[PDB]
Design a protein around this ligand. Structure first.
Ligand SMILES: Nc1ncnc2c1ncn2[C@@H]1O[C@H](CSCC[C@H](N)C(=O)O)[C@@H](O)[C@H]1O
Length: 226
């Protein structure tokens, strides 16, 4: 297979689409896969760096897809303003951190209907974004691959945000993580790392209080999904 496990997880969520845009597409293997399997009719394969975009175009050529996949050089979503970009069913953003991803989302556009994001940092700020704009978080899951964790979140802009509890905003809608031994294991390991820090910094530092509260928030959330 041409996709890593986490990229296949993104591809399962995409079907019967007219146009998708892969932000940070690198070598465009996800757009290529999606077009080859008739999940999308066309794809925009976008990158901020021209260098991997050159490899992407060659890849598109070697599979005979230049009429269906189009390389775009762009910082995030700046290109979507343009008049030749069609309405986009799904924008996918994979393999970036939440901070970078949230900044890209500042240029969210009415042409875009859904996001699938695969962040390599926890996505509390992306869930806050969805909630504060009243977008549905349609799907979340938690992925381990190549000695790294990944946070997958699907946002449907045409449906209302669920009324997430504050612990859910922090760690994920219970719906998607109930009984999830992988994620619970990760969160217990987060408590261990925080405990190490509590045995090193001064209890009068404000960080001690904040870290003590983080631990208790995690333990509460663990107890709910356990
Ligand atoms: N602000 C930005 N806008 C568009 N692309 C960006 C970007 N910042 C980083 N990138 C690109 O995003 C890619 C991250 S590597 C991710 C590759 C692939 N999408 C995957 O998930 O496996 C790099 O190619 C980098 O050039």
């Amino acid at each position: 297979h041409m996709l890593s496990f986490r990229l296949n997880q993104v591809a399962k969520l995409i079907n019967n689409s007219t146009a998708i845009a892969d932000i940070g597409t690198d070598h465009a293997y996800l757009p290529i896969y999606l077009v080859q399997n008739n999940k999308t009719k066309i794809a925009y394969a976008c990158d901020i760096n021209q260098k991997p975009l050159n490899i992407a175009l060659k890849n598109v050529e070697k599979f005979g897809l230049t009429g269906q996949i189009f390389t775009i050089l762009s910082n995030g979503l700046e290109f979507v303003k343009n008049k030749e970009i069609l309405n986009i069913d799904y924008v996918t953003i994979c393999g970036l951190g939440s901070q970078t991803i949230l900044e890209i989302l500042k240029n969210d556009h009415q042409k875009i209907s859904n996001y699938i994001i695969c962040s390599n940092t926890s996505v509390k700020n992306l869930r806050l974004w969805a909630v504060s704009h009243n977008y549905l978080i349609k799907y979340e899951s938690f992925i381990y691959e190549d000695d790294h964790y990944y946070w997958l979140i699907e946002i449907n802009k045409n449906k209302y945000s669920d009324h997430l509890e504050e612990l859910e905003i922090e760690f994920g809608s219970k719906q998607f993580f109930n009984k999830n031994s992988l994620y619970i294991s990760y969160l217990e390991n987060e408590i261990s790392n925080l405990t190490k820090i509590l045995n090193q910094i001064n209890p009068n530092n404000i960080k001690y209080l904040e870290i003590q509260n983080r631990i208790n928030k995690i333990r509460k959330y663990i107890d709910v999904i356990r």
